[PDB]
Amino acid sequence: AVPFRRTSKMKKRLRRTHFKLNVPGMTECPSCGEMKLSHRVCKACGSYNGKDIN
Amino acid sequence: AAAAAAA
Amino acid sequence: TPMANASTIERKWLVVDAAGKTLGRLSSEVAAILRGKHKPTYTPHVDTGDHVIIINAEKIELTGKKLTDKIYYRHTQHPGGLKSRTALEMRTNYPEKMLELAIKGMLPKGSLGRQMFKKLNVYRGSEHPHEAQKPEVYELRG
Amino acid sequence: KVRPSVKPICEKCKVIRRKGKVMVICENPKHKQKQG
Amino acid sequence: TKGILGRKIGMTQVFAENGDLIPVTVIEAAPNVVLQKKTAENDGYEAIQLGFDDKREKLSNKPEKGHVAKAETAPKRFVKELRGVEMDAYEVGQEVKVEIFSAGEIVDVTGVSKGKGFQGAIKRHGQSRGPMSHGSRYHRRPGSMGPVDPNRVFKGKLLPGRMGGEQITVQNLEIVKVDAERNLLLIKGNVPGAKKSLITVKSAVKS
RNA sequence: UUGGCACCUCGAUGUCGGCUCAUCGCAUCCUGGGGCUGUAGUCGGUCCCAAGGGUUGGGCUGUUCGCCCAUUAAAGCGGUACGCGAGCUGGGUUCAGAACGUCGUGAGACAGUUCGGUCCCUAUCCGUCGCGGGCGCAGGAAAUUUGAGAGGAGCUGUCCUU
RNA sequence: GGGAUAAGUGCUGAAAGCAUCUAAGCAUGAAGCCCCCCUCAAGAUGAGAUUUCCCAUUCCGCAAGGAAGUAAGAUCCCUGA
């Protein structure tokens, strides 16, 4: 449970290839925008298909 | 001897 | 100062018939052809060798009692994975990889060795599908 | 019997060399010897 | 040989001609439409394609719609090959039904087994369990990886992992009853897989 | 196996016996095929070819070993740091306490015996067991597939006819 | 259940006019072997094969090539096993 050798810079950067995170499913809000993530109520106008329900 | 009793 | 060819190599196609020769004596000549030892423009890092086609691989023969005594091993990465067959069974079913194992044994080991293995083409006799390349018949030196 | 000292036991024994192996055959089956 | 492929519904029990009680697996496996005939001069081997459980046009692609246009049928959910059937004996678009199997025959049943998730070595490999008492801190663990001298673990060391989801063939099952009206096959014994999964029933290798 | 030497390790290579997991070699315990028998048949003896598979549940003792009970087709020998403690237990060896016998004036000692006695580690890399993301496979795709190769399985008893 | 086999059992036969399981030619023969039973398998860079869709735009780069939109198709997001 003890590291025998230190990790080099290149192996660390290769391990950090998949550490990035993705862009969310964000789309144009039909009321005002911009923008609104899919299948959630818009935080700006408080509308959802298409009534102001807050 | 060689007793493994390390503390 | 001396010449060293690179991307100017002209590669020819040769047909070698294995009806009466050994496994064996022809395989070293084919490996030397594939390395490019017959050309004066040989450069050891650029693969100046040319293509060769071997036909009648089932007609190969080998002297002595090697038909029952010579054993080919194909050990896996598993314990107890030693699998063995004789030279008669390897010739009777499919002698193509018999000939390619001979050439791979006599070729150098490395990236160029795997590249020069790609120019080899071994077929069961006596026709090859490379008539579009117009290969010439090569006779063995002995 | 398999022994590395294959020898003719009696006068009827005959020494032969089947398959590169020294053997003795005889009319008596007790005298049958092989090596290797 | 002959065979047919379908969906199993569940298990029931049927007594037949005596007092004896038989565990019975119910399979919906009809109709199956011949989609493609593989030939040795073109494909290199002899086989037939069977399609089962046709679906809506919304769930089918344009290549899937064009592939079944030759057989004059709707696109189907399950396509598998049978090899080697008695060539030819079937034309492209002919319906294969459950009447090919009599209710005394011996068949081979194959399918994808039920998934168990990532499981330990005791359940996945049947390995024996360590003591729970007399000071022991050892149970539910796979074991020693091997000797010291190779300086490595040999390939094939049984370790925890995902169990199930693989193809399992159960050999020499017997048909109890065939239902031509409701497209049902009644098979003696247990059949691998979960409910409403794809089950392929082929004739056994006799004898 | 018991030894011999002291080449490697004393700025540490954890040492017995069990548990778990195994793998390999036959100088083969059974099963398979045979030769010779002072083999009438069953059961046997010896020597060949054969590692494919399988080779047990207890009582005693820390014990391996060994003896005994009951089976079995048989309860085979060994190697892998006398396989395996960053996988597990400390019963015995092998700490600090206290006794018995013996030796020693004595402090103390005893492969002589007995009672009791802290077993740490969050896995970096190679290895193994599973599951993904890329790119390639000279256009982009949805399906169905051949098989170069690889893994799994491989054991046998009893009864009736002849 | 097939094929080549080990130990064995042999047939026809000469070196050596005989004899002979062998030096040429044919067999038979084991839970060994290679298949038939099951499973993974074209990253098998040697990247295989069959069926069926989509089509051959625009703008630069005179050649190689590079950007934008899209068809077939797939994904982000959501309901779940």
XYZ file of C-alpha atoms (C1' of nucleotides) in Angstrom:
689
model
C 0.000 0.000 0.000
C 3.079 2.196 -0.449
C 4.080 3.715 -3.836
C 7.402 2.218 -4.941
C 8.174 5.008 -7.416
C 6.761 8.481 -7.859
C 4.406 9.082 -10.754
C 5.973 11.056 -13.575
C 4.309 14.102 -15.105
C 3.318 12.316 -18.321
C 1.666 9.350 -16.568
C -0.233 11.764 -14.307
C -1.435 13.748 -17.332
C -2.427 10.499 -19.071
C -4.439 9.485 -16.006
C -6.087 12.922 -15.970
C -7.395 12.429 -19.538
C -10.860 11.302 -18.396
C -11.035 13.600 -15.345
C -12.708 16.326 -17.439
C -16.447 16.918 -17.169
C -18.970 17.351 -19.955
C -21.080 20.265 -21.193
C -24.635 19.983 -19.765
C -27.715 19.348 -21.885
C -28.466 23.041 -22.328
C -31.017 24.268 -24.893
C -32.807 27.450 -25.959
C -35.622 28.447 -23.629
C -38.702 29.308 -25.747
C -39.780 32.094 -23.378
C -36.653 34.184 -22.803
C -33.375 32.275 -22.407
C -30.454 32.109 -22.487
C -30.101 29.257 -21.951
C -32.082 26.479 -20.229
C -30.978 22.940 -19.404
C -33.235 20.187 -20.728
C -36.123 18.748 -18.657
C -35.839 21.439 -15.963
C -37.681 24.668 -15.218
C -35.881 27.793 -16.440
C -34.352 29.784 -13.588
C -34.798 33.115 -15.389
C -38.479 33.196 -16.381
C -39.814 30.317 -14.272
C -41.740 28.801 -17.189
C -42.164 25.232 -18.415
C -44.140 24.325 -21.608
C -45.238 27.079 -21.427
C -47.031 28.432 -18.394
C -45.331 30.641 -15.825
C -45.421 28.126 -12.976
C -42.321 29.448 -11.122
C 14.574 -16.512 17.364
C 13.615 -14.148 14.444
C 10.361 -13.161 16.152
C 8.260 -10.686 14.154
C 7.137 -8.421 17.000
C 7.872 -4.950 15.638
C 6.066 -2.124 17.429
C 28.527 10.468 -48.386
C 27.441 7.004 -49.757
C 23.971 6.568 -51.179
C 21.068 5.683 -48.885
C 17.689 5.220 -50.554
C 14.466 6.347 -48.882
C 11.003 6.428 -50.537
C 12.658 5.733 -53.928
C 12.748 1.940 -53.568
C 11.286 -0.055 -56.456
C 9.853 -3.368 -55.243
C 9.400 -6.319 -57.597
C 7.267 -9.441 -57.199
C 8.811 -12.916 -57.301
C 7.272 -16.394 -57.491
C 9.113 -19.213 -55.704
C 8.033 -22.816 -56.301
C 8.562 -25.260 -53.426
C 7.929 -28.634 -55.100
C 11.287 -30.282 -54.465
C 13.260 -28.077 -52.093
C 13.520 -28.276 -48.312
C 11.721 -26.218 -45.669
C 14.626 -25.170 -45.025
C 17.228 -24.288 -47.632
C 14.721 -22.108 -49.511
C 13.586 -20.219 -46.399
C 16.965 -18.544 -45.832
C 17.054 -17.446 -49.487
C 13.497 -16.078 -49.217
C 14.438 -14.228 -46.012
C 17.504 -12.766 -47.752
C 15.275 -11.694 -50.660
C 12.823 -10.063 -48.235
C 15.654 -8.256 -46.442
C 17.059 -6.927 -49.718
C 20.465 -8.622 -49.658
C 20.361 -9.203 -53.435
C 20.151 -5.477 -54.282
C 23.157 -3.105 -54.302
C 20.966 -0.313 -52.889
C 20.534 -2.110 -49.551
C 20.096 0.216 -46.587
C 19.479 -1.500 -43.230
C 16.819 0.897 -41.883
C 14.428 1.500 -44.803
C 13.398 -2.057 -45.972
C 14.777 -2.163 -49.536
C 13.527 -5.749 -49.960
C 10.854 -6.826 -52.412
C 7.734 -8.990 -52.436
C 7.865 -12.778 -52.821
C 5.069 -15.309 -53.437
C 5.446 -18.983 -52.504
C 3.276 -21.584 -54.246
C 2.979 -25.370 -53.722
C 3.482 -25.122 -49.954
C 1.919 -28.571 -49.531
C 4.649 -30.037 -51.769
C 7.405 -29.078 -49.306
C 9.551 -31.898 -47.922
C 12.154 -32.222 -45.190
C 14.813 -34.875 -44.773
C 15.459 -37.396 -42.027
C 12.749 -38.534 -39.642
C 11.505 -34.976 -39.054
C 7.972 -35.842 -40.212
C 7.351 -37.587 -36.882
C 10.087 -36.046 -34.698
C 9.901 -32.286 -35.354
C 7.409 -30.743 -32.923
C 5.848 -27.273 -33.091
C 4.930 -25.561 -29.811
C 2.316 -22.800 -29.419
C 2.285 -22.177 -25.639
C -0.383 -19.841 -24.289
C -0.256 -17.578 -21.255
C -2.231 -20.166 -19.234
C -0.733 -22.849 -16.948
C -0.488 -26.194 -18.686
C -0.962 -24.425 -22.024
C 1.697 -26.300 -23.996
C 0.070 -27.465 -27.234
C 2.096 -29.535 -29.673
C 1.801 -31.046 -33.141
C 4.179 -32.920 -35.401
C 5.529 -31.689 -38.724
C 3.331 -34.163 -40.624
C 0.123 -32.743 -39.136
C 1.324 -29.183 -39.752
C 2.161 -29.997 -43.380
C -0.994 -32.039 -44.059
C -3.590 -29.569 -42.804
C -2.065 -26.143 -43.471
C 1.671 -25.762 -44.281
C 1.339 -22.025 -44.930
C 2.140 -20.983 -41.372
C 4.847 -23.662 -41.319
C 6.580 -21.664 -44.055
C 5.786 -18.327 -42.385
C 7.170 -19.580 -39.054
C 10.358 -20.588 -40.880
C 10.639 -17.117 -42.471
C 9.750 -15.384 -39.182
C 12.483 -17.376 -37.465
C 15.047 -16.357 -40.082
C 13.917 -12.713 -40.333
C 15.286 -10.050 -37.955
C 13.230 -9.112 -34.901
C 11.765 -5.624 -34.760
C 9.474 -3.241 -36.592
C 11.282 -3.820 -39.897
C 11.002 -7.573 -39.356
C 7.229 -7.316 -38.967
C 7.174 -5.021 -42.019
C 9.182 -7.470 -44.159
C 6.945 -10.308 -42.990
C 4.041 -8.483 -44.673
C 5.613 -8.853 -48.130
C 5.594 -12.651 -47.805
C 2.633 -14.475 -49.372
C 2.327 -18.254 -48.937
C -0.446 -20.178 -50.685
C -1.500 -23.767 -51.183
C -0.560 -24.700 -54.724
C -0.502 -23.892 -57.434
C -2.305 -20.590 -58.061
C -1.991 -17.172 -56.419
C -4.404 -14.208 -56.563
C -1.595 -11.723 -57.334
C -1.633 -11.974 -61.140
C -2.544 -8.271 -61.268
C 0.916 -7.417 -59.909
C 2.543 -9.370 -62.816
C 5.096 -11.360 -60.768
C 8.200 -12.846 -62.360
C 9.443 -16.389 -61.796
C 12.519 -16.517 -59.552
C 14.879 -19.487 -59.688
C 16.796 -20.434 -56.552
C 20.577 -20.087 -56.488
C 20.957 -23.417 -54.676
C 10.779 -58.312 -19.741
C 12.442 -54.920 -20.236
C 16.095 -54.821 -19.165
C 19.240 -53.072 -20.477
C 21.109 -56.411 -20.499
C 19.270 -58.228 -23.304
C 21.048 -61.580 -23.720
C 20.163 -64.978 -25.244
C 18.984 -67.154 -22.364
C 18.865 -70.480 -24.239
C 20.108 -71.857 -27.555
C 16.779 -71.202 -29.297
C 16.998 -67.457 -28.596
C 17.556 -65.155 -31.580
C 18.878 -61.598 -31.310
C 17.089 -59.026 -33.493
C 17.147 -55.240 -33.838
C 13.559 -54.093 -34.454
C 13.017 -50.293 -34.495
C 16.566 -49.545 -33.362
C 16.025 -51.616 -30.207
C 17.947 -54.778 -29.337
C 15.463 -57.611 -28.812
C 15.512 -61.367 -28.231
C 12.697 -63.560 -29.545
C 12.352 -67.252 -28.765
C 9.927 -70.156 -28.919
C 9.650 -69.891 -25.130
C 7.717 -66.665 -24.368
C 9.560 -66.218 -21.051
C 12.769 -65.405 -22.963
C 11.314 -62.349 -24.744
C 13.555 -59.385 -23.883
C 13.589 -55.742 -24.970
C 15.706 -52.702 -24.142
C 14.779 -49.047 -24.530
C -31.533 -30.212 -38.315
C -34.439 -27.952 -37.348
C -35.016 -25.140 -34.890
C -37.088 -22.125 -33.922
C -36.553 -19.149 -31.629
C -38.852 -17.132 -29.411
C -39.740 -15.630 -26.032
C -40.322 -17.591 -22.841
C -43.168 -16.551 -20.551
C -42.642 -18.446 -17.306
C -42.813 -21.810 -15.631
C -45.808 -23.980 -14.744
C -46.510 -27.640 -13.958
C -48.359 -30.164 -16.121
C -49.276 -33.773 -15.358
C -49.536 -35.952 -18.452
C -50.969 -39.489 -18.961
C -50.134 -40.579 -15.371
C -50.016 -39.118 -11.897
C -46.471 -37.832 -12.429
C -45.878 -34.087 -12.181
C -43.609 -32.385 -14.720
C -41.985 -28.929 -14.435
C -42.886 -27.099 -17.642
C -41.401 -23.972 -19.236
C -43.714 -22.002 -21.558
C -42.212 -20.422 -24.700
C -43.933 -18.228 -27.288
C -41.900 -18.991 -30.406
C -44.139 -18.560 -33.464
C -44.328 -17.309 -36.218
C -40.759 -17.065 -37.545
C -40.149 -15.773 -41.079
C -37.131 -16.810 -43.170
C -35.276 -13.603 -44.028
C -32.035 -14.689 -45.721
C -30.573 -17.963 -47.002
C -26.795 -18.276 -46.734
C -25.194 -20.288 -49.536
C -21.740 -21.853 -49.743
C -20.923 -20.330 -53.144
C -21.645 -16.779 -51.903
C -21.323 -16.687 -48.101
C -18.976 -19.654 -47.617
C -21.407 -21.635 -45.441
C -25.007 -22.837 -45.348
C -27.429 -21.144 -42.947
C -30.859 -19.512 -42.806
C -31.923 -16.325 -41.020
C -35.050 -16.366 -38.844
C -36.910 -13.233 -37.770
C -39.218 -13.061 -34.765
C -41.437 -10.545 -32.917
C -42.112 -7.840 -35.506
C -42.316 -4.260 -34.257
C -43.561 -0.815 -35.218
C -42.097 1.163 -38.111
C -40.979 3.878 -35.679
C -38.520 1.503 -33.976
C -37.021 0.154 -37.225
C -34.292 1.724 -39.340
C -34.250 2.157 -43.105
C -31.574 -0.601 -43.499
C -33.779 -2.814 -41.302
C -36.800 -1.979 -43.466
C -34.838 -2.702 -46.641
C -33.396 -5.981 -45.358
C -36.861 -7.469 -44.741
C -38.263 -6.170 -48.044
C -36.977 -9.269 -49.858
C -38.861 -11.625 -47.508
C -42.104 -9.550 -47.785
C -42.530 -9.031 -44.051
C -42.402 -6.417 -41.317
C -39.061 -5.628 -39.634
C -38.428 -7.921 -36.689
C -36.766 -7.514 -33.301
C -34.744 -10.743 -33.144
C -32.636 -12.121 -36.004
C -30.432 -15.194 -35.551
C -28.885 -17.796 -37.840
C -29.414 -21.559 -37.761
C -26.530 -23.777 -38.845
C -26.689 -26.212 -40.302
C -30.249 -26.849 -41.428
C -31.204 -29.313 -44.170
C -30.613 -27.212 -47.268
C -32.764 -26.002 -48.686
C -36.267 -27.067 -47.433
C -37.281 -23.420 -46.794
C -37.804 -20.483 -49.137
C -37.277 -16.817 -48.314
C -40.348 -15.513 -46.520
C -41.749 -18.905 -45.500
C -43.222 -18.954 -41.997
C -41.605 -21.346 -39.519
C -44.104 -22.454 -36.882
C -44.256 -24.720 -33.843
C -45.737 -27.626 -35.831
C -42.202 -28.733 -36.800
C -41.725 -30.058 -33.239
C -43.706 -33.053 -32.024
C -44.420 -33.453 -28.322
C -41.984 -36.300 -27.710
C -38.812 -34.897 -29.200
C -35.427 -34.036 -27.695
C -34.234 -30.464 -28.253
C -31.420 -28.079 -27.333
C -32.379 -24.866 -25.515
C -30.007 -21.890 -25.420
C -30.266 -18.305 -24.224
C -28.652 -15.452 -22.337
C -28.641 -16.197 -18.610
C -29.863 -13.878 -15.859
C -27.530 -11.113 -14.734
C -26.288 -11.139 -11.146
C -24.081 -8.041 -11.089
C -20.578 -7.824 -9.699
C -20.387 -10.749 -7.280
C -17.775 -12.223 -4.967
C -15.708 -15.340 -5.515
C -17.855 -17.462 -3.164
C -20.960 -16.996 -5.314
C -19.271 -16.640 -8.718
C -16.888 -19.602 -8.474
C -18.364 -21.749 -5.695
C -15.267 -21.318 -3.538
C -15.416 -22.481 0.061
C -15.789 -20.030 2.930
C -13.394 -19.171 5.744
C -14.150 -19.676 9.427
C -16.282 -17.142 11.296
C -14.755 -17.811 14.727
C -11.715 -19.141 16.652
C -10.031 -15.788 16.127
C -10.374 -15.855 12.342
C -10.530 -12.625 10.358
C -10.898 -14.560 7.089
C -14.125 -15.295 5.195
C -15.695 -14.460 1.798
C -12.258 -13.886 0.207
C -10.910 -15.521 -2.979
C -7.663 -16.979 -1.630
C -3.948 -16.931 -2.284
C -3.041 -15.791 -5.791
C -0.403 -18.508 -6.124
C 3.250 -19.273 -5.418
C 6.159 -16.887 -4.980
C 8.570 -18.203 -7.648
C 6.810 -17.009 -10.886
C 6.663 -13.449 -9.361
C 3.210 -13.103 -10.942
C -0.357 -14.350 -10.834
C -1.132 -17.123 -13.311
C -3.831 -16.452 -15.885
C -7.131 -18.047 -14.950
C -7.073 -17.192 -11.243
C -10.705 -17.105 -10.154
C -11.615 -13.677 -8.787
C -14.777 -11.627 -8.118
C -16.451 -10.002 -11.100
C -19.687 -9.736 -13.029
C -21.851 -12.878 -13.059
C -24.407 -13.658 -15.743
C -25.445 -12.149 -19.030
C -23.679 -14.900 -20.984
C -25.057 -17.469 -23.406
C -25.969 -20.751 -21.691
C -27.059 -23.916 -23.510
C -29.016 -26.631 -21.684
C -28.847 -29.952 -23.503
C -31.387 -32.748 -24.081
C -34.666 -31.252 -22.906
C -37.996 -32.841 -23.842
C -41.098 -31.215 -25.329
C -44.112 -31.894 -23.118
C -46.835 -30.378 -25.306
C -47.127 -28.264 -28.456
C -49.867 -25.639 -28.900
C -50.427 -24.779 -32.561
C -53.381 -22.479 -31.832
C -51.696 -20.213 -29.260
C -48.080 -20.607 -30.553
C -46.711 -22.233 -27.382
C -44.010 -24.823 -26.704
C -44.072 -26.722 -23.406
C -40.573 -27.932 -22.502
C -39.621 -30.232 -19.629
C -37.086 -28.806 -17.192
C -35.521 -25.402 -16.556
C -34.637 -22.854 -19.236
C -31.888 -20.215 -18.801
C -32.754 -16.537 -18.887
C -35.232 -14.136 -17.381
C -38.889 -13.750 -18.289
C -39.784 -12.388 -21.775
C -36.214 -12.910 -23.024
C -35.113 -14.476 -26.299
C -35.002 -18.291 -26.241
C -33.735 -20.365 -29.176
C -34.947 -23.978 -29.357
C -32.979 -26.204 -31.735
C -33.062 -29.955 -32.306
C -30.590 -31.931 -30.215
C -27.464 -33.624 -31.572
C -28.671 -37.220 -31.983
C -27.447 -39.644 -31.020
C 15.666 -36.125 4.020
C 19.980 -35.689 7.346
C 24.595 -33.489 6.213
C 29.192 -30.496 4.238
C 30.815 -25.226 2.521
C 29.571 -20.192 3.934
C 28.325 -17.612 -2.168
C 23.255 -13.741 -1.184
C 20.504 -11.101 2.438
C 21.985 -8.836 9.845
C 20.542 0.525 7.470
C 15.218 -7.059 8.603
C 14.503 -12.442 3.062
C 8.608 -13.412 9.349
C 10.226 -18.655 10.661
C 6.180 -24.802 12.232
C 1.338 -26.857 11.920
C -3.569 -25.830 10.124
C -7.659 -22.560 6.846
C -8.455 -20.516 1.619
C -6.861 -20.845 -3.386
C -4.157 -23.613 -6.549
C -0.504 -25.147 -10.320
C 3.260 -28.472 -12.156
C 6.471 -33.614 -12.863
C 5.606 -38.888 -13.039
C 9.474 -42.677 -10.130
C 0.890 -44.222 -11.441
C -3.274 -45.067 -5.935
C -7.683 -46.038 -9.054
C -9.871 -45.886 -13.817
C -8.003 -47.132 -19.793
C -4.840 -50.390 -23.251
C -0.901 -54.567 -22.975
C 3.600 -58.538 -22.296
C 5.324 -62.658 -18.989
C 3.179 -65.693 -15.244
C 4.582 -71.756 -11.024
C -2.222 -66.841 -15.018
C -7.903 -73.515 -14.552
C -12.097 -68.761 -13.428
C -12.672 -64.556 -9.599
C -8.811 -62.238 -6.991
C -3.511 -61.801 -7.798
C 2.404 -60.874 -8.729
C 6.045 -58.367 -11.894
C 7.271 -55.135 -16.038
C 5.576 -51.644 -20.187
C 2.347 -47.284 -22.592
C -0.306 -43.681 -20.452
C -1.074 -36.897 -15.869
C -7.426 -37.028 -18.961
C -10.143 -36.917 -14.502
C -10.619 -38.187 -9.398
C -7.826 -39.289 -5.259
C -12.431 -39.190 2.486
C -15.149 -38.286 7.296
C -13.581 -38.846 12.155
C -10.911 -40.171 17.762
C -5.658 -38.904 19.967
C -1.796 -35.269 19.949
C 0.309 -27.789 18.326
C 1.845 -31.332 15.668
C 3.867 -33.139 9.792
C 4.278 -38.062 10.566
C 2.076 -42.066 13.054
C -1.914 -45.564 15.453
C -7.089 -46.757 15.478
C -12.683 -46.554 13.847
C -15.986 -46.522 9.295
C -15.961 -46.213 4.099
C -14.156 -46.017 -0.878
C -12.421 -47.241 -7.438
C -8.390 -45.393 -4.720
C -7.816 -42.673 -0.001
C -0.189 -41.767 -4.663
C 4.459 -39.728 -4.066
C 7.007 -35.045 -4.488
C 8.284 -29.463 -6.447
C 6.479 -24.427 -6.442
C 10.992 -19.338 -0.332
C 9.843 -27.700 3.336
C 3.792 -22.890 -2.539
C 0.644 -19.308 -0.153
C 0.778 -14.470 7.296
C 1.046 -6.149 2.488
C -4.786 -13.533 2.032
C -6.157 -15.634 7.579
C -5.136 -18.029 12.856
C -0.900 -18.117 16.901
C -1.927 -24.018 19.411
C 4.083 -25.134 19.447
C 8.681 -22.844 19.055
C 10.725 -17.698 20.476
C 10.433 -11.838 24.922
C 9.140 -9.574 29.662
C 5.550 -13.204 35.182
C 5.338 -17.682 38.012
C 6.136 -22.844 39.341
C 8.155 -28.629 39.228
C 12.740 -31.876 38.460
C 18.045 -31.289 37.860
C 22.832 -28.325 37.938
C 25.207 -24.205 40.160
C 27.615 -21.307 47.083
C 25.272 -17.544 44.123
C 23.162 -14.261 40.499
C 20.942 -17.829 37.221
C 20.584 -22.193 33.374
C 18.203 -26.445 30.837
C 15.601 -29.362 22.664
C 13.341 -31.052 30.108
C 7.795 -30.048 31.596
C 3.391 -26.745 32.782
C 0.041 -22.107 33.330
C -0.528 -16.995 30.747
C 1.203 -13.746 27.005
C -0.187 -6.422 21.571
C 0.362 -10.552 14.275
C 0.576 -2.656 11.493
C -0.307 -0.973 6.164
C -5.814 3.867 2.678
C -2.237 -0.671 -3.653
C 2.050 3.540 -7.095
C 3.820 -0.093 -11.091
C 3.852 -5.083 -13.219
C 0.513 -9.097 -12.681
C -4.778 -11.291 -12.431
C -10.704 -10.744 -12.468
C -14.583 -7.579 -14.756
C -16.460 -2.990 -17.078
C -15.908 1.593 -20.214
C -14.017 5.821 -23.478
C -10.920 6.819 -28.104
C -8.593 5.693 -32.764
C -7.713 2.169 -36.677
C -9.755 -1.456 -40.117
C -9.050 3.992 -47.317
C -16.826 6.655 -47.743
C -20.597 7.047 -43.560
C -24.053 3.498 -41.208
C -27.840 -0.747 -39.133
C -27.868 -5.836 -38.514
C -26.231 -11.040 -39.352
C -21.901 -13.787 -39.179
C -17.041 -17.448 -40.940
C -13.258 -18.816 -37.604
C -6.730 -17.869 -36.881
C -6.685 -18.581 -31.774
C -8.265 -19.383 -26.594
C -10.961 -21.206 -22.375
C -14.460 -24.802 -20.056
C -15.766 -30.146 -19.562
C -13.089 -34.893 -19.215
C -14.391 -38.999 -12.706
C -16.737 -43.413 -11.653
C -19.811 -47.271 -8.106
C -23.950 -50.878 -7.657
C -27.881 -54.138 -9.714
C -30.234 -57.377 -13.896
C -29.346 -60.242 -18.417
C -25.875 -62.930 -21.486
C -18.666 -41.549 -32.476
C -14.268 -40.293 -36.531
C -8.496 -39.373 -37.864
C -3.401 -40.115 -36.961
C -1.090 -42.867 -32.526
C 2.059 -45.030 -27.653
C 3.036 -49.855 -25.350
C 1.592 -54.327 -27.607
C -0.533 -57.820 -31.720
C 0.453 -58.438 -36.752
C 0.389 -59.286 -42.800
C 3.653 -59.544 -47.205
C 8.645 -59.619 -47.403
C 14.560 -59.207 -48.464
C 19.511 -57.506 -46.431
C 21.428 -62.797 -44.763
C 18.030 -68.051 -51.083
C 16.011 -69.812 -44.467
C 13.975 -67.165 -40.505
C 12.085 -62.238 -39.341
C 6.998 -56.522 -36.831
C 10.895 -53.023 -40.569
C 15.242 -51.795 -43.330
C 10.468 -50.107 -48.355
C 4.577 -51.097 -48.299
C -0.071 -52.066 -45.350
C -2.960 -52.660 -40.848
C -5.188 -53.103 -35.588
C -4.571 -50.819 -31.002
C -5.548 -46.442 -24.693
C -9.831 -42.655 -19.872
C -3.085 -39.728 -23.681
C -3.401 -36.080 -28.898
C -6.826 -33.412 -32.869
C -11.983 -33.035 -33.562
C -17.227 -33.953 -32.631
C -20.148 -31.203 -26.511
C -20.291 -25.935 -24.501
C -18.389 -20.671 -24.378
C -15.428 -16.186 -25.818
C -13.752 -14.844 -30.273
C -11.348 -10.186 -37.219
C -7.145 -4.764 -32.270
C -6.649 -12.371 -36.413
C -2.922 -3.931 -37.521
C -3.080 -10.761 -41.629
C -8.229 -5.622 -38.791
C -12.185 -11.113 -42.957
C -17.385 -12.187 -45.205
C -22.804 -11.402 -46.452
C -27.631 -8.410 -46.626
C -29.767 -3.486 -46.755
C -29.921 2.153 -46.518
C -27.456 7.365 -47.551
C -25.627 9.780 -51.498
C -22.357 12.194 -54.265
C -23.504 19.646 -51.509
C -21.344 24.860 -50.459
C -16.876 27.982 -49.634
C -11.339 28.380 -49.699
C -6.928 26.151 -51.132
C -4.737 26.200 -58.801
C -2.202 19.889 -56.588
C -2.342 17.497 -51.892
C -5.858 19.140 -48.574
C -8.919 22.338 -44.993
C -13.712 24.592 -42.894
C -19.865 25.026 -42.719
C -24.571 22.663 -43.215
C -26.675 17.749 -43.960
C -28.662 12.422 -45.705
C -28.695 7.184 -43.713
C -27.842 6.717 -38.650
C -26.464 7.868 -33.666
C -26.021 10.871 -29.287
C -27.150 14.944 -25.293
C -31.814 15.121 -21.966
C -35.929 12.230 -19.769
C -39.317 7.419 -18.079
C -37.462 2.662 -16.284
C -35.485 -2.631 -15.586
